[PDB]
Amino acid sequence: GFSSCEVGIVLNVTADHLGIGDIDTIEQLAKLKSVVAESVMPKGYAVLNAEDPLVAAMADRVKGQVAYFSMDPNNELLLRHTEAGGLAAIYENGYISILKGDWTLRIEKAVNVP
Amino acid sequence: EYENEQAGRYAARAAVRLCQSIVDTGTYPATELQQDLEDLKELKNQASLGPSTEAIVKEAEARGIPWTQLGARFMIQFGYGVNQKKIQATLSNQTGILGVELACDKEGTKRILKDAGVPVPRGTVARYFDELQDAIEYVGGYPIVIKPLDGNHGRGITIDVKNWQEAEEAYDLARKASKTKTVIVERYYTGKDHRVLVVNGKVVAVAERVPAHVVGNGKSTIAELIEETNRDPQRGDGHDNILTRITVDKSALDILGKQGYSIDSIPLKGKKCFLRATANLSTGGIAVDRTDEIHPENVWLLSRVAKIIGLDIAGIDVVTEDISQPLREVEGVIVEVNAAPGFRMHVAPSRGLARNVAGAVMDMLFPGSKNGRIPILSVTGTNGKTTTTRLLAHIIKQTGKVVGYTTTDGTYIGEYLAETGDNTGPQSAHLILSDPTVEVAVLETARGGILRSGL
Amino acid sequence: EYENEQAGRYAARAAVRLCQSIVDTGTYPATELQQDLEDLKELKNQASLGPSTEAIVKEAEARGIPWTQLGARFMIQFGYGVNQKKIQATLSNQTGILGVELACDKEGTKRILK
Amino acid sequence: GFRMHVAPSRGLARNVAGAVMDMLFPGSKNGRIPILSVTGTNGKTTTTRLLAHIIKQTGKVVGYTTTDGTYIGEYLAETGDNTGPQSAHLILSDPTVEVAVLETARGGILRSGLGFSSCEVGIVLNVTADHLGIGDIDTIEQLAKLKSVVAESVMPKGYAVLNAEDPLVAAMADRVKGQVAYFSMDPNNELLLRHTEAGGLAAIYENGYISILKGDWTLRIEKAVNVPITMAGKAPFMIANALAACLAVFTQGVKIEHIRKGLSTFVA
Numbered sequence: 001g002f003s004s005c006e007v008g009i010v011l012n013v014t015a016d017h018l019g020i021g022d023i024d025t026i027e028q029l030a031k032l033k034s035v036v037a038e039s040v041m042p043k044g045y046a047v048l049n050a051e052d053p054l055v056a057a058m059a060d061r062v063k064g065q066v067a068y069f070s071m072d073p074n075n076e077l078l079l080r081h082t083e084a085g086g087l088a089a090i091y092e093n094g095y096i097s098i099l100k101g102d103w104t105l106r107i108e109k110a111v112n113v114p
Numbered sequence: 115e116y117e118n119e120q121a122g123r124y125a126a127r128a129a130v131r132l133c134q135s136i137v138d139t140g141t142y143p144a145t146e147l148q149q150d151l152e153d154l155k156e157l158k159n160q161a162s163l164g165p166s167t168e169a170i171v172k173e174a175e176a177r178g179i180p181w182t183q184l185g186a187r188f189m190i191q192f193g194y195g196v197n198q199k200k201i202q203a204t205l206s207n208q209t210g211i212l213g214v215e216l217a218c219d220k221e222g223t224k225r226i227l228k229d230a231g232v233p234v235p236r237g238t239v240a241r242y243f244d245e246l247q248d249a250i251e252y253v254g255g256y257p258i259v260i261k262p263l264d265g266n267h268g269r270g271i272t273i274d275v276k277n278w279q280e281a282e283e284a285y286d287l288a289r290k291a292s293k294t295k296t297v298i299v300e301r302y303y304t305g306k307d308h309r310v311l312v313v314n315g316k317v318v319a320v321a322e323r324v325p326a327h328v329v330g331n332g333k334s335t336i337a338e339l340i341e342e343t344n345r346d347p348q349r350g351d352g353h354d355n356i357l358t359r360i361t362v363d364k365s366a367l368d369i370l371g372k373q374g375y376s377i378d379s380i381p382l383k384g385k386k387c388f389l390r391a392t393a394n395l396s397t398g399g400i401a402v403d404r405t406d407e408i409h410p411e412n413v414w415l416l417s418r419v420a421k422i423i424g425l426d427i428a429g430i431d432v433v434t435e436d437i438s439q440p441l442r443e444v445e446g447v448i449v450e451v452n453a454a455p456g457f458r459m460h461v462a463p464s465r466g467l468a469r470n471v472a473g474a475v476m477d478m479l480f481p482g483s484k485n486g487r488i489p490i491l492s493v494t495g496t497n498g499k500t501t502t503t504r505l506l507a508h509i510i511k512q513t514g515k516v517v518g519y520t521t522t523d524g525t526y527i528g529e530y531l532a533e534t535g536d537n538t539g540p541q542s543a544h545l546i547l548s549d550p551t552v553e554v555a556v557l558e559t560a561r562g563g564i565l566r567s568g569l
Numbered sequence: 570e571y572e573n574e575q576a577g578r579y580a581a582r583a584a585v586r587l588c589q590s591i592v593d594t595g596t597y598p599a600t601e602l603q604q605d606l607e608d609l610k611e612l613k614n615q616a617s618l619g620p621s622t623e624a625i626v627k628e629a630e631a632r633g634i635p636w637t638q639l640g641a642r643f644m645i646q647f648g649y650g651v652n653q654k655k656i657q658a659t660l661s662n663q664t665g666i667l668g669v670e671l672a673c674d675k676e677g678t679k680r681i682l683k
Numbered sequence: 684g685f686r687m688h689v690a691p692s693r694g695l696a697r698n699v700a701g702a703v704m705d706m707l708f709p710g711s712k713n714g715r716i717p718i719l720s721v722t723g724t725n726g727k728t729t730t731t732r733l734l735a736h737i738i739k740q741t742g743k744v745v746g747y748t749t750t751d752g753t754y755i756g757e758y759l760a761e762t763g764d765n766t767g768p769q770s771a772h773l774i775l776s777d778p779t780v781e782v783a784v785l786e787t788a789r790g791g792i793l794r795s796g797l798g799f800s801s802c803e804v805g806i807v808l809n810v811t812a813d814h815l816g817i818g819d820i821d822t823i824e825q826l827a828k829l830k831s832v833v834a835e836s837v838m839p840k841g842y843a844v845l846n847a848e849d850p851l852v853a854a855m856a857d858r859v860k861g862q863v864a865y866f867s868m869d870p871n872n873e874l875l876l877r878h879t880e881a882g883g884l885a886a887i888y889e890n891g892y893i894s895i896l897k898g899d900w901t902l903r904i905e906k907a908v909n910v911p912i913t914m915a916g917k918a919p920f921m922i923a924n925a926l927a928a929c930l931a932v933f934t935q936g937v938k939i940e941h942i943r944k945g946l947s948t949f950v951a
């Protein structure tokens with residue numbers, strides 16, 4: 001519905017309903033969902049799930065910065081991404097934390113959020 | 115390539131001497147090599163910035179803000195022209211003289227804070243012995259604290275006294291140690307000492323100082339742990355590391371004598387046993403981060419205190435039993451305010467998350483996504499440098515802007531000649547970029563200037 | 570009416586003593602009168618602002634700007650709330666520590682100016 | 684020291700202090716903030732708290748002092764009585780306060796006088812001879828003369844909010860510098876109606892409504908049954924306080940929707 005988006009979030013790709021239209025494979029589903037990520041302006045951000053191999057594979061062919069989020073604090077891809085640059089989000093010790101490189105910014109305890 | 119100018123020049127001079135010696139005799143004496151290395155280390159240590167200003171400069175470089183070193187008083191200048199700021203260590207060019215002078219005055223600071231309703235320790239001043247007993251019922255009983263009016267490094271100050279004779283001897287010690295013969299007595303407040311850092315009226319980091327101590331959880335006593343801690347790589351001396359080596363001094367020996375145990379006395383169950391009670395990092399204590407555990411009302415109160423005193427970067431000392439509760443329910447108090455604090459303990463807490471203090475300082479100095487840059491136009495060539503420079507300056511002057519430009523005739527700032535001579539090298543470009551009134555810079559860059567000292 | 574609080578209270582206390590003495594004995598000793606006047610002059614000189622801050626306060630009063638006297642270090646506060654300023658003698662609350670320290674250093678000031 | 688320039692002895696004197704004051708306060712401005720002083724006999728504290736809550740709807744930090752304590756925004760700043768001039772200095776010296784609301788008690792005026800020179804708004808609720816003989820106030824005329832200090836100490840561009848149903852309070856209409864705004868629980872008060880015909884700024888309770896009269900125009904605020912403090916309009920003492928609180932902020936340019944939102948959510 002538009003040309004460029006300032007922020008593009010991709011949550012997950014799961015083959016649950018298939019056979020609709022010309023989409024018959026999870027690779028085609030990922031290729032279709034990649035439209036949002038690829039249509040991000042050079043100064044925008046693409047937020048991606050680091051725990052999904054298909055979503056993380058959209059890291060390439062993206063104009064603009066990439067920010068990973070992961071429910072596992074020990075994701076090797078996310079940790080390697082933070083070492084040179086940053087902007088990740090993890091759930092480390094009952095906390096919702098933002099990693100801006102080598103700095104950790106704790107938001108909330110994840111039990112005070114209804 | 116060099117990192118320090120003098121060190122690089124010395125190494126360049128020494129390399130040819132070493133080569134001449136080795137081609138003349140076949141080897142170089144080891145003593146001369148050791149002398150050269152120690153001289154190089156001395157030059158490296160001579161031209162080195164402090165642990166705080168270097169941390170700030172690292173953030174300034176990362177954000178792409180130009181920085182130069184002034185030659186007056188170890189001051190550093192960020193930015194160019196009308197967009198420049200200056201810092202010395204933690205003091206900025208906007209820190210007020212009145213705020214620093216008020217913070218350095220303990221008794222006036224306490225009165226000002228009390229008039230504003232901030233909880234401060236209840237105390238009294240005394241100059242004669244007969245008055246002492248009177249002050250005792252004014253503060254509310256025991257325990258009490260005896261301190262001098264003016265002192266450095268804690269001269270003649272007691273911590274906890276609970277009877278008459280110790281109070282009298284502490285009073286005599288303080289009176290003979292104080293420069294004005296007079297002594298303040300406060301009520302003693304129990305709790306954990308906290309150090310709060312306030313930048314731009316916002317709390318950045320909170321740390322709790324745990325005094326130097328050892329825990330016998332490994333079925334080992336003090337005698338081994340004193341040196342076991344000293345062998346940890348985190349410990350160090352100087353002004354760079356938080357954790358200093360555990361100094362077993364005569365005063366420290368007496369303090370651990372007042373503990374009630376011995377050197378070889380094994381701790382029971384593996385419980386903390388302390389070596390001193392001052393709760394200072396110089397003694398060898400540790401810091402614990404508590405930034406996420408602070409109550410919002412305490413944050414508001416400390417932000418208000420920092421503005422009442424009038425400091426943009428401040429370090430406040432708090433004595434309370436728990437920082438997670440407001441300072442009214444618990445008998446928490448504000449002990450002192452420091453004008454030029456060192457954030458060295460907040461970037462390496464050793465028992466928590468590190469905070470980016472330098473990022474906050476840069477966010478205060480340069481608020482938005484901006485740097486301290488001004489338009490720079492550099493003209494080079496072979497034939498028409500001066501005429502083009504003057505024409506560019508005249509064209510820009512039509513816009514209501516102050517233009518600083520350097521040519522072969524001289525260095526001009528606006529309409530008045532600022533310096534005479536050739537002035538086409540990098541040494542005359544610093545005069546233009548450091549003026550607090552220049553908005554646009556026009557520079558004639560000659561060939562000799564590039565060859566001699568670079569751009 | 571009084572101009573200085575302590576001096577006014579002292580004069581009020583001394584007036585009744587003088588009246589009692591004169592109604593009891595018919596006159597008042599001149600030495601006591603001289604003592605009272607010199608004491609009043611001492612109180613007047615004790616609570617007096619410097620020649621610079623009083624000149625600034627006179628202009629502040631003429632412009633209708635409220636002013637109070639802080640109890641810390643002879644500082645004067647103009648205004649209320651978020652619109653307040655502070656002066657000591659000629660130093661304001663915006664005068665920088667770095668500038669004053671550099672000005673107090675003759676040799677560094679000369680190098681910077683050169 | 685610039686004092687060698689103000690008396691050269693061989694030339695023209697220069698106004699250095701004028702330059703210093705022009706640097707500290709650049710334009711034609713002073714260091715003043717809005718001050719609302721509430722006085723009376725019965726409803727000082729409730730009116731002070733309601734005024735503070737109404738102003739808080741605008742994005743401003745309000746410092747107010749009542750009998751319960753001294754508050755700066757949302758956090759308690761000091762405990763105790765705090766209704767005298769000594770507690771007014773804490774509010775006016777805070778570097779974060781933008782509006783000041785002060786409950787001015789009688790004992791504070793008698794003991795040390797008023798805590799300021801001029802106030803933007805002065806509210807007088809009522810004068811009732813209930814406690815008498817304290818100090819040298821032994822007549823209701825002296826009590827009215829004492830309470831008149833707040834009304835008479837209003838700057839020429841300020842407002843004096845007065846109760847039209849009190850013959851003693853309404854008598855303070857004279858010897859007041861600045862405009863006068865009446866409030867009354869009886870919509871047919873002849874003095875208020877005559878006041879609105881030439882000018883305006885009155886507040887009445889006409890038909891189950893809290894109304895502002897700006898001359899010949901009526902601006903209805905609320906139905907007086909949706910205001911929790913009135914207890915569905917059963918307590919007549921609370922509506923009198925609400926009228927004064929709304930009229931005080933209306934004269935200062937506060938929007939109607941802010942007044943309505945503040946009045947609808949205030950809890951005792």
Ligand SMILES: Nc1ncnc2c1ncn2[C@@H]1O[C@H](COP(=O)(O)OP(=O)(O)OP(O)(O)=S)[C@@H](O)[C@H]1O
Binds near residue numbers: 235268269431
């Ligand atoms: N009322 C009190 N209750 C508890 N601890 C207190 C109290 N007063 C002082 N202290 C402690 O004693 C210390 C005294 O502050 P100091 O910083 O030592 O003052 P000082 O004499 O200026 O020494 P320096 O030069 O500033 S390090 C505080 O930091 C607290 O740890």
Ligand SMILES: Nc1ncnc2c1ncn2[C@@H]1O[C@H](COP(=O)(O)OP(=O)(O)OP(O)(O)=S)[C@@H](O)[C@H]1O
Binds near residue numbers: 496497500501
């Ligand atoms: N574009 C050009 N091409 C060739 N000659 C030129 C040009 N512009 C100027 N000249 C000649 O060069 C002379 C000197 O040039 P300037 O205007 O002084 O610039 P300049 O290079 O800064 O001078 P210098 O370096 O101090 S000798 C002029 O008087 C002209 O005669």
Ligand SMILES: Nc1ncnc2c1ncn2[C@@H]1O[C@H](COP(=O)(O)OP(=O)(O)OP(O)(O)=S)[C@@H](O)[C@H]1O
Binds near residue numbers: 724725920921
């Ligand atoms: N306008 C009013 N007329 C008559 N009585 C009133 C009025 N407003 C309030 N009251 C009554 O007076 C009581 C006390 O008023 P408060 O709200 O405490 O104001 P207050 O005058 O600050 O209180 P004080 O002075 O500390 S006793 C209330 O509980 C009501 O019963």
Ligand SMILES: [Mg+2]
Binds near residue numbers: 499500521522
């Ligand atoms: Mg030339």
Ligand SMILES: [Mg+2]
Binds near residue numbers: 727728
């Ligand atoms: Mg009350």
